[PDB]
């Protein structure tokens, strides 16, 4: 199977600049009559994909001529020379030359903006969820940048790892920001049994922390 | 105009059997060439079977050979993918893409139908709200929120003040939990808002045909 291996995975650009992504085959993807069926696709999170680019180099039907693609053997560029926010989301290749057709990894393209530091927020557990026996805490860590941040939690003054599940946003359309959710679930009792919970973010040191005693 | 709307998809134990269906307007069916193509959860993009526009060809990847048979009736203007066997791996976002028979590929793809392969039960949110408490003490903005937890399958929908509340809201992507989701909701108003105008966040649950409303009160 022609294996499409595409790089980088993610692609921070400033609006108005020129972004590259690359796509590399395992193997030959030529047809006999010597064209080679390599199509570029641009997803959002919100849309189905949209075919971009068709036949390596060619713009399909109202693609903007900032988009251009090159490529040659086993290695492929999609080119986008002045990067839009309308441009923003996922970038996948795709060979059609040989059963199965395979598609590239993807690469999200994101936009850059200035450093920002999370507003960090804690919750307590319900009452209504005290009431089921369990005891969530809540921390949310909204419209920072860049999107590496790390949760730390601690109960009574010392780290606490197990019961954390983490999310995140896409990047928001109009801040470029990103947000966090970190959730810590214990049991009822393992939350009576102690009073201080507190919620970190660092990297960004020193830490931004939240904090609540039961 | 030139659209496919695919339908079919749900929720089905492993081992069991399911049929998708693509619908084609607004271009002559009978000479396109049609595909089903998948995505992960992890966003990665499969292509799962072929048909050509008049039947003679179809074709699949190894993965799905003897469980996925791809079959079209140009007359009622429709696509097929029958699904037998599903196995965990089958969990995906399948779309219907065409591919002209007479270059292109996949110039037009349908919005998706969702497949989920899984024992696990459908079960309805449990609805907690999120409010501060002591802590700190006041600034000029509050930010509260919901946390929609143990509910299966996937999606959630949540508001705020039923949509009149939409700017400074964040909904984060769900996480399994123990077999079931959870996802959290926050909402950032001006301190002079609340706890003095009302915040509720509203989440539905489709699969399990619920509704939930809750007022987030100051503790």
């Known amino acids: 199977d022609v294996l499409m291996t595409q790089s980088p995975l993610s692609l921070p650009v400033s609006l108005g600049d020129q972004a590259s992504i690359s796509c590399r085959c395992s193997?030959?993807?030529?047809?006999?009559?010597?064209?080679?069926?390599l199509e570029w696709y641009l997803q959002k999170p919100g849309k189905s994909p949209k075919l971009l680019i068709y036949?390596?180099?060619n713009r399909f039907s109202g693609v903007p001529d900032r988009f251009s693609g090159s490529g040659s053997g086993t290695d492929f560029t999609l080119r986008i020379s002045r990067v839009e926010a309308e441009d923003l989301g996922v970038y996948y290749c795709?060979?059609?030359?040989?059963?199965?057709?395979?598609f590239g990894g993807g690469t999200k393209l994101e936009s850059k903006r200035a450093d920002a530091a999370p507003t960090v927020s804690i919750f307590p557990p319900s009452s209504e969820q005290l009431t089921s026996g369990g005891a969530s805490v809540v921390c949310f860590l909204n419209n920072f940048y860049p999107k590496d941040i790390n949760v730390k939690w601690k109960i009574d003054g010392s780290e606490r790892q197990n019961g954390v599940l983490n999310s995140w946003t896409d990047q928001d359309s109009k801040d470029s920001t990103y947000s966090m959710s970190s959730t810590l679930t214990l049991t009822k009792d393992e939350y009576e049994r102690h009073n201080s919970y507190t919620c970190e973010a660092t990297h960004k040191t020193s830490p931004i922390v939240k904090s609540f005693n039961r | 105009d030139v659209k496919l709307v695919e339908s079919g998809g749900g929720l089905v134990k492993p081992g069991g059997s399911l049929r998708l269906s693509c619908a084609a307007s607004?271009?002559?069916?009978?000479?396109?060439?049609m595909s089903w193509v998948r995505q992960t959860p992890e966003k990665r993009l499969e292509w799962v079977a072929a048909?050509?526009?008049?039947?003679?060809?179809?074709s699949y990847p190894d993965s799905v050979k003897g469980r996925f048979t791809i079959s079209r009736d140009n007359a009622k203007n429709n696509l097929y993918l029958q699904m037998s066997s599903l196995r965990s791996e089958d969990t995906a976002l399948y779309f219907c893409?065409?591919?002209?028979?007479?270059?292109?590929?996949?110039?037009?793809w349908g919005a998706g139908t969702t497949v989920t392969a899984s024992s696990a039960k459908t079960t309805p949110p449990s609805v907690y709200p999120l409010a501060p408490g002591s802590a700190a003490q006041t600034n000029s903005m509050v930010t509260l929120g919901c946390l929609v937890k143990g509910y299966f399958p996937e999606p959630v929908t949540v508001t705020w003040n039923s949509g009149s509340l939409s700017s400074g809201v964040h909904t984060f992507p769900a996480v399994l939990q123990s077999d079931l989701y959870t996802l959290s909701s926050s909402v950032t108003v001006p301190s002079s808002t609340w706890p003095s105008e009302t915040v509720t966040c509203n989440v539905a649950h489709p699969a399990s045909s619920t509704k939930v409303d809750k007022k987030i009160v100051p503790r």
């Open positions: 193997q030959s993807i030529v047809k006999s009559n010597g064209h080679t069926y």
């Open positions: 893409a065409r591919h002209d028979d007479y270059p292109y590929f996949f110039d037009v």
């Open positions: 607004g271009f002559t069916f009978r000479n396109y060439g």
């Open positions: 036949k390596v180099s």
């Open positions: 048909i050509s526009g008049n039947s003679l060809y179809t």
């Open positions: 795709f060979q059609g030359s040989h059963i199965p057709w395979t």
